[PDB]
Design a protein around this nucleic acid. Structure first.
Lengths: 107, 50, 87
RNA sequence: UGUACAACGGGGUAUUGUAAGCAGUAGAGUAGCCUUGUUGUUACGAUCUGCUGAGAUUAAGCCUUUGUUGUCUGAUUUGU
RNA sequence: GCGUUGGAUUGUUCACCCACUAAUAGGGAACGUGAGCUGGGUUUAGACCGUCGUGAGACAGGUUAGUUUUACCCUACUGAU
RNA sequence: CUAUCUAGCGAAACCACAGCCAAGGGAACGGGCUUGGCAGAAUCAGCGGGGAAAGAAGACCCUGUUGAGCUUGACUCUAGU
RNA sequence: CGUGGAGGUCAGUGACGAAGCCUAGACCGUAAGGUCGGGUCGAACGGCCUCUAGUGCAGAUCUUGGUGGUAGUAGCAAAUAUUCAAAUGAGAACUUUGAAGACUGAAGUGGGGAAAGGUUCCACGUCAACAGCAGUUGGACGUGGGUUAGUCGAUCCUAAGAGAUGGGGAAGCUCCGUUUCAAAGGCCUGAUUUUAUGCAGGCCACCAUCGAAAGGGAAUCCGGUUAAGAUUCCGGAACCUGGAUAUGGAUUCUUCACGGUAACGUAACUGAAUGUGGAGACGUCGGCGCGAGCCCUGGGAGGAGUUAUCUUUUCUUCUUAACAGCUUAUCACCCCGGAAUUGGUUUAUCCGGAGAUGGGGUCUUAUGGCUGGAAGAGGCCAGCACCUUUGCUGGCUCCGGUGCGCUUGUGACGGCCCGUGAAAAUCCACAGGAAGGAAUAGUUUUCAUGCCAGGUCGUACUGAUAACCGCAGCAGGUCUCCAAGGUGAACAGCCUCUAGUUGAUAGAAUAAUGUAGAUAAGGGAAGUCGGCAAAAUAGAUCCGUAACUUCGGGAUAAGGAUUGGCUCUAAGGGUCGGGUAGUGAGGGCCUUGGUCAGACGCUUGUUGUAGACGGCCUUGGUCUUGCUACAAUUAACGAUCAACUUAGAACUGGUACGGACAAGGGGAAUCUGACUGUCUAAUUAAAACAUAGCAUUGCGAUGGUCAGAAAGUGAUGUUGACGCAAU
RNA sequence: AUGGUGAACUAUGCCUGAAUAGGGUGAAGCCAGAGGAAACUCUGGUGGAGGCUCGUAGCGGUUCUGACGUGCAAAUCGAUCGUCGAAUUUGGGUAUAGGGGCGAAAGACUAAUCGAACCAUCUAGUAGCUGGUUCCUGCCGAAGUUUCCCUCAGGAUAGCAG
RNA sequence: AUAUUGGCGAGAGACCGAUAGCGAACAAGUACAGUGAUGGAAAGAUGAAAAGAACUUUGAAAAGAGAGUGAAAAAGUACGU
């Protein structure tokens, strides 16, 4: 049975794309009978079409990696590919230096 | 072209009506020499040019 | 590229349907149909083109008035109604 | 139906370069604390050492093998 | 019968030198060999300089930049049934 | 990855007829003419000598009482002044 | 000899069978050809005497059509990709589903559109044809369905420009101009009560029309719903325009308002012709401030993942619209005050007696905050059972933090010019004072509320290595908005999350020769016309840098030293606090009593529950202070917070450290064009053209240069010698 | 030659909008400091200019004279390239047209065509120049020579022949 | 009294017979190509009458073999010869 239409319809009613809709083949006999959104909608609540929860993109290395940089690691000459102004412009360092001098004198 | 004009659409509506094969009764008419729709138009092989 | 790569840069329309003959010869910028002429008060037909004239002379349409003119003169332009002869 | 053959496994040869895991008063040191020290330990700590001159691979065109399992008659054609 | 080279200059045929070596002999095969290669030169079109012409233009003149295509046939040859 | 073999699909270029050589003459460097050499099916993958191979009734030279572009104290006119 | 037709003739042949075609069967003629036999086949044809002509075939790179060998050959090899099982089906490397493995890596192989296409959109059934393999699959075939607008656009305005009148040319098709040698129009008050709308005056003069669905433009969003529609449909909630009528409020015998010194405010708070002003209306670049979306992240409330060992662990939901009330900023302005001992002040030095700093206020309301819309909406979860049509009960949907972060918007600025960087429709306001008006009520419909209507046209889909154009489903071309995580300067390369594909013939060995990547011991350009192709350095930090010059450059010149990991050191900020004793509020006043809104909530009453434990007063132990005192100050301190940047020190690694990607060969000169730039789109990118500079020439408009067939025509010219035109 | 069509490609102008990561260098102007008697000169910060520069998106294309060259392609693909906030790139509207437009010129572009467009008619244009020129048999059967011609890849005259 | 390939209505031929005759004997100025002015074809004859194939069998079907119709399907719609 051609189930392309049902996969399309199941994507829209649930909301997720076609890569997260699961239409089992063991009971595919009645899946092709669903030719409407209401028919597909009741196929979701009973448990026929699971949501195929999102693939993990765990940023656990990055949190540890950024933790290392915050400690003072990976801050050598071989870890840099741009000039000292691309990384931190001297204008910002000067602006950060004036605005604290201006307010300190004002304070 | 999405944002069309009625003059263009009235021509396309004419094309849709004439985009059909012969009804079978035609071939059974007395002294009939017609066997195919020589005016068939499709959107791939030929263009209407409006 | 003067060939195939330059044939994909054409998506505009120079001519459009002529409101008088519907042959898509109505130049947009020039506002003059190139087949009959519009909104000129005369249909262009040159003697150096004879096939083109033969395509638009009397007989290529319906003759909504002249198919009856020969018949109307065929009797003498009578008016009124008809009589009852027999049967 | 043969100290036949084949697939695995074993041994040898070789490439490689010393693993997984545990342990270590090894470790530049960093700080908490408590009986506050004449190694105080807890947590982290690139790395190092001990089993590991190991581990992995080793035939696809390396060698040998009594071990385990398995195979041994399908089709076609041929004469003075 | 066998062997007759490596380089500087030049597109170079040619030629002149450096050097080795036994020796650096001459040549033909559609001035062998571009559906083997290169395009350095001469040879379309761009452009510069000199002479000539009133001019458009001309010069074995000098210089720079200038797409080079196909064998899936037969024979011949190289291997195989 | 192709080329190779296999399952499916499946053209074109080109074609007087075809395709082994030496020598001779010949329109004076033909596969077929002559004289000799030789010659045994069916073929397969490469190859590039050849078929003066293919692509276009040579863009070079000349003829034509054939043109075109350009130039000028060529001839004859001419819009403008 | 033969071919198409015509006159005559043979009363010629013929469906028990003409013509035509086939026939290594026969006969006649040297030959052109003629006759017969057989097979095929079904409607006309032949001999002879003459006439007539579109009358004969091998080729003219002859016209049209068809078929060959080549040949079952060339080939169906770019875009890093496929595999297993089941289902359907006579028929699965390709259809569907499930399970893996990958890719595009968010300047998509993702979401929407402009032009273009025109039903390709969706459903059913189906494979003769197309999808250069196949196919029960399709952008294919047959039949049907689908596009809902007062707010989105077209509609309207005008730009560059087109063009109709009046006119002038032209034999003329038509050409010039379009406000110019045109007496070119409607319009409010009054008349009213045959005036229907004429008429008597005040009047203004613009002066066809078209022309930009990314130029200006009146007004709306959210939730949900189809097989295919939506800012259009359902529900809820808005605003604008045209019109009619009242209700409510303000105004008034100071008849057409008050307050504030003022900037100005208060929902309303008369008003014509005419004139004026504002908006529409607007260059580019650079930095800074602020806002939104996204990114990062803490607490808590749930779900999913791992769990040989460890991880208060990983991922995921926690959201709020158009519209409305209150409130909120730079800039700017106003009142007092008066300045040198000059002071405020931006990252970027402008401002101040034409009046600062300071104190106090006004204003635009982008934006933002609370509330209504609106939590009854959406989202994440637990139980109920319904072959079903489906729902009910339910919980949460919360409190934060930082930043040179990316996209974008906006504000005050600064730089640039022999470029200073659009028009109109439309809307509003001011000066003016015409006209009318009081309270026995007349206005007020640019105050609040109420009533009605918003016509026509488009809305489906693609928008691209299959929907557009390139004869095709052809590696080509085609305008634009959104765009995450990590390394990294980075929208660079590389890997991944959301989303989407897994698609472009396949199977086996995998010969040469190839195309695309590569590696080579020693020498090294000896090769070649020419180091052409490859190669080397190539990121970042520190040191160092010549000849010459137009002094700006050459110059990251040339040439040297480091780069990983762990543990540390130092430096670079924000926000709060400058006392003790009596006193007043401890405007939290919790606490003990209740007084009585102490009530809902857990159909009158039974009598049962809390009073929301809260307005209202306390005898109170209940970390901000005005007064005095010690003497109040220095040293400056103490508490919280979250960023990266830079430098340095030890240790450590078979001395490896821009470890993958990423990424300058350099120098002495010579010829020539000054440089940036441009051209032979399909063989020449150049010393060629162009450019600034220099010089010359013509021209004072009854003109200089140029156009037209004329013109009452034009381009320079919306111009003037520092200009135009020709070099 | 006559009469018509074409700037949807490209050539130029105008009107209207749209697009251009990240670094290097460092000008005025300004501030502070130092020197000196003055004139004024040096040091350290900002500052962002600059038809500058390295380099993506984009526009062209230099070289390999690579690939292909009966191709994916009537000129494309890969690497190596010049430039990249401006005499930048481009959409839409508009204007300029055939011996005429437009040209930072190359006789370049003018919708695969241009030192001179496309279409139709005159037109079956003319050619001393190539090619072809369609059945049998019988009989006879030559010439490349004279003269003239802007004549010598041609005619006329005479000749040969029926 | 003269001309008249246009329009209507007719009569004819030593004309052509559908690669000829008008481009078109046919859904012909039609399909189609070009942005455009314009260019522009191919296509007649199953049989007297569809009587154009009931039904059997094989195959998934398309179809085949029979049967049958029809003088004749060596007339079965891709149909005179």
């Amino acid at each position: 049975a051609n189930l392309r239409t049902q996969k399309r319809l199941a994507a829209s009613v649930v909301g997720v794309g076609k890569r997260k809709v699961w239409l089992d083949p063991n009971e595919t006999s009645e899946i092709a009978q669903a030719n409407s959104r209401n028919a597909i909608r009741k196929l979701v609540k009973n448990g026929t079409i699971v949501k195929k929860a999102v693939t993990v993109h765990s940023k656990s290395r990055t949190r540890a990696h950024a933790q290392s940089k915050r400690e003072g690691r990976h801050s050598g000459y071989g870890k840099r590919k741009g000039t000292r102004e691309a990384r931190l412009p001297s204008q910002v360092v000067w602006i950060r230096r004036l605005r604290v001098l201006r307010r300190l004198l004002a304070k | 072209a999405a944002q069309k004009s009625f003059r263009i659409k009235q021509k396309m509506a004419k094309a849709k009506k004439q985009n059909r094969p012969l009804p079978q009764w035609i071939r059974l008419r007395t002294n009939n020499t017609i066997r195919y729709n020589a005016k068939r138009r499709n959107w791939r092989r030929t263009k209407m040019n409006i | 590229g003067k060939g195939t790569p330059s044939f994909g840069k054409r998506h505009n329309k120079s001519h459009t349907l002529c409101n008088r003959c519907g042959r898509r010869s109505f130049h947009v910028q020039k506002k003059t149909c190139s087949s009959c002429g519009y909104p000129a008060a005369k249909t262009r037909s040159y003697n150096w083109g004879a096939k083109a004239k033969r395509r638009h002379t009397t007989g290529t349409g319906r003759m909504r008035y002249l198919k009856h003119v020969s018949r109307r003169f065929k009797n003498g332009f009578q008016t009124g109604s008809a009589s009852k002869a027999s049967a």
